[PDB]
Amino acid sequence: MKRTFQPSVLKRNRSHGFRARMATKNGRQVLARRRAKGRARLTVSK
Amino acid sequence: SRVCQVTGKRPVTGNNRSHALNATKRRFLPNLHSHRFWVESEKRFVTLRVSAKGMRVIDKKGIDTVLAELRARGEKY
Amino acid sequence: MIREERLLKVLRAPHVSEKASTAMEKSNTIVLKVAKDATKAEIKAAVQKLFEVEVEVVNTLVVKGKVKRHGQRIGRRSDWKKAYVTLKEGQNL
Amino acid sequence: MKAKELREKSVEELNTELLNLLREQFNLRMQAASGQLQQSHLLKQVRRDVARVKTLLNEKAGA
Amino acid sequence: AAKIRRDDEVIVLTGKDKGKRGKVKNVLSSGKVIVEGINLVKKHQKPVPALNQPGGIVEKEAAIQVSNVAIFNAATGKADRVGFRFEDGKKVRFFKSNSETI
RNA sequence: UACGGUGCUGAAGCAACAAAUGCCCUGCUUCCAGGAAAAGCCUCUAAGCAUCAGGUAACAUCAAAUCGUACCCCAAACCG
RNA sequence: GCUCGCCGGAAGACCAAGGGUUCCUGUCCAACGUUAAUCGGGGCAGGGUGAGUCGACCCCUAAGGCGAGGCCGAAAGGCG
RNA sequence: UAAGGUGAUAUGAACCGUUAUAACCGGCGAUUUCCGAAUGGGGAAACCCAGUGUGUUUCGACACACUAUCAUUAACUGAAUCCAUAGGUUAAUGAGGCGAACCGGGGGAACUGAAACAUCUAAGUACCCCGAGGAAAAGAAAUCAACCGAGAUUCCCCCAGUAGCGGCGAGCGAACGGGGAGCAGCCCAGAGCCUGAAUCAGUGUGUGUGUUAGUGGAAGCGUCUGGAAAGGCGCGCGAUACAGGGUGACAGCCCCGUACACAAAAAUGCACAUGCUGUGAGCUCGAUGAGUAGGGCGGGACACGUGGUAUCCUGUCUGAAUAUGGGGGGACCAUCCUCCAAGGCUAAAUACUCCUGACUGACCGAUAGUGAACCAGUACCGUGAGGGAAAGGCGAAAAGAAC
């Protein structure tokens, strides 16, 4: 039936997208914890 | 935050303690009213953010170091 | 005069391909491999400053390297950029 | 210096990035994609010679 | 520095047939040496379908760990030392015994 | 060609009738819930200028990048 | 191949967001795939989608978001 | 610094060296794409698009250069607006983002305890917000102390579980002073005499010795088991060197090493002299920290919780004196002692590890030890914050198995 995931990049890249996460108080902190975890990517949008 | 520019007056630590005897916080602040005045080194009248007694500090304390300290912090007048 | 050439490094392969030897009935235009360093704004007027060629029309195409390499890991075969340039007869390059 | 001061001057070496690129590099361009360039040092011997001048244009020849 | 350098005869204490010695060909930045006449392994290799292969035994000189190899003394059929000390400067081999720096 | 097609060339190519989901139609009538904005676009004028630039009409003529383009597609190429 | 049964406002054909070479050809046997595999959408080697006009961008705007100067908040941050 | 090398998967291919461009190591620089502070102007992570100049030809256009805002300050300009101010256009200096700890200030719980709860406990503890430096912060007595005296501060141990506070419950809890480490103190509201005098900071040099780019370093042979020994047999030898690893079943003498020694354009720790530069000792007179010291109301931090209650602070009203004065000393008063607040700075004895090097563990040795001893925060799961593995070990050795 209907899934809760419905794919669209316009919406997913303004949702969990890097550019406003890199421009907001707590979004900047996700990036700092991910540099500390040592992830290959900081983004989740590609 | 609402602060006095000539005295550096800041928010304070303080409690209710009456009805009840409790250490409950209430947020205590200086009440701002401002003053529009003259300093002879500026070619203009100046409006500066001041609170209670802060205008009476300008009356008889030397302020040229504070007028420079505001500018050393980049604060505007 | 006709732009500065202090940076000029046009072309990367004389190239060999089957669309030039199994469907090429007219010498009009020849296919090349040029990489992500070329554009139809440039390869129409700049190639003549390095090579002795004559060109009247061009095309360019991105050409992705499909998907996957030998593993190791998935990796890439890499995109290689396709170009089509005027020839009209014989060999030019 | 002795013979390195004879007939070569800074204002001629100022154009070396053109004369290397339109000669020494051009004679090697796409020849590995033609099967004519197999000797892996022929490019390596014409690298660095421009970078040497582009450095000496701001770095001095002594202590 | 490798005491056996690169073209010396090494007595090879290893193997069964002690009456034989080898000669150096190359040295690695690892604890390894390539020596001609080290173990005489013939080795056939598993064949390949395509392209011309030389085929048969390769008879190639193999690797040994640098600890197992010392120079042949050319006097009594024993191992010897080379030395690297020279009180005027940089290293030289002198059989740990010569009046000259050779 | 003893054959995968070949690839030059060509006849008839008209009329009624029924209807849009299409066109005249960002038409008309009618209803009352009166149903985005701005730029490109068209004009008026300031500045700018006649060394021209710009405009109208006609003839010539250059490039027009950037990324896209395959395929699945109401699906074993989207999600379960 | 031939004959049979079914859909046919779909079980046909095209498409935007969706994914992105899964297309076309040869080849594979090992892993996979509701049995078995000679088959592949899974593997390997080859072949390929060219633009001023069609898509997106270049230019415009709604709801809204961000924002020098100006303001609020210990502050981060928020308005505008 | 050397006679051999040109990264790894990794083969394959091709060359580069002996003496200066083989390879490469240390220092000081040059160059330093797009996104990211990210900043010419815009953006939905690496894309999109200008402004202002210079130069030049055949001038349907390239090459090269400069450019967020904010703040400080100046220049030029300039609205209402006269003087002026913003606004406009530049320049010089400065913040901005980041790995780690130490560390300064702010906002600040609930859990838990009182064997229920409400002041109190817990606790200025976590989490959060901003942020600086080699350390941060501390700092040169309107201070303690009790009539004897001490004479900035920090750290360590005592002081202490002592005093003091407590729905006097449950509980809380200093400071003075002592021991040790350690030992720089000064300036302005002024300026004459004095003159670079005291005391430190920055930098150069030399001496002594470590560190840094480096690597030379004594002695073992035969024979036996066995695939092969360093074991076993026989006998020696070096030892200011028998640490440990590696090397074919027990190595000081096979190899690396060890002890030991050499190693410097230039930089540096530590000791010690000194060339240069900066600060600038000393004398005397004069002045001296006011809308504040307090007081009132309502509170805070001090161990102290409206008490007999002090100190220090202050939202807010009020407000006094200058040595013939004022503060503090557990209410308050008198006495007496002891200081000079409402102005400004500062040395290191202390703390710590992003990062460079070294030494130690009856440390673990793979259901152990860090999410991982292997292209592991990878594969992979989730819309997302977030979460996230599995396989160590052939043998002396590829000797990797032709025919």
Defining key terms:
part of a larger assembly; 5 chains; A: 46 residues; mainly alpha; Helix Hairpins; 3 helices; 0% strand; B: 77 residues; alpha+beta; two-stranded antiparallel ribbon; 2 strands; 18% helix; 8% strand; RNA-binding; ribosome
Describe this structure in words.
This is part of a larger assembly, with chains A (46 residues), B (77 residues), C (93 residues), D (63 residues) and E (102 residues). Chain A has 46 residues and is an all-alpha fold. Chain A has one domain: Helix Hairpins (Orthogonal Bundle). Chain A contains three helices and no strands. Helices cover 18% and strands 8% of the residues of chain B. Chain B has a two-stranded antiparallel sheet with strand order 1-2. In chain B, strand 1 (35-37) and strand 2 form a beta hairpin. The longest helix of chain B is centred in the C-terminal third of the chain and has 9 residues, at 64-72. The radius of gyration of chain B is 16 Å and the shape is elongated. With 93 residues, chain C is mainly beta. Helix content of chain C is 0%, strand content 15%. Chain C has strands spanning 29-33, 58-61, 82-86. Chain C has a three-stranded antiparallel β-sheet with strand order 1-3-2, with no helix packed on it. Chain C is flat. Classes of the chains: A mainly alpha (46), B alpha+beta (77), C mainly beta (93), D mainly alpha (63), E mainly beta (102). Chains in contact: C-D. The interface between C and D is small, with 12 and 10 residues. Chain B binds three RNA strands through loops.
Strand order of the largest sheet of chain B: 1-2
Give a short account of the largest sheet of chain C. 3 strands, antiparallel
Helix content of chain B: 10-25%
> Could you tell me the number of beta strands of chain C?
3
- Strand order, main sheet of chain C: write it out: 1-3-2
Main interface pair? Answer: C-D, 12 and 10 residues
Basic shape of chain C = flat
Q: Span from first to last CA of chain B?
A: 17 Å
Find the count of extended strands of chain B (DSSP E, 2+ residues): 2
Distance between the termini of chain C: 25 Å
Please identify the structural class of chain B as seen in this structure.
alpha+beta
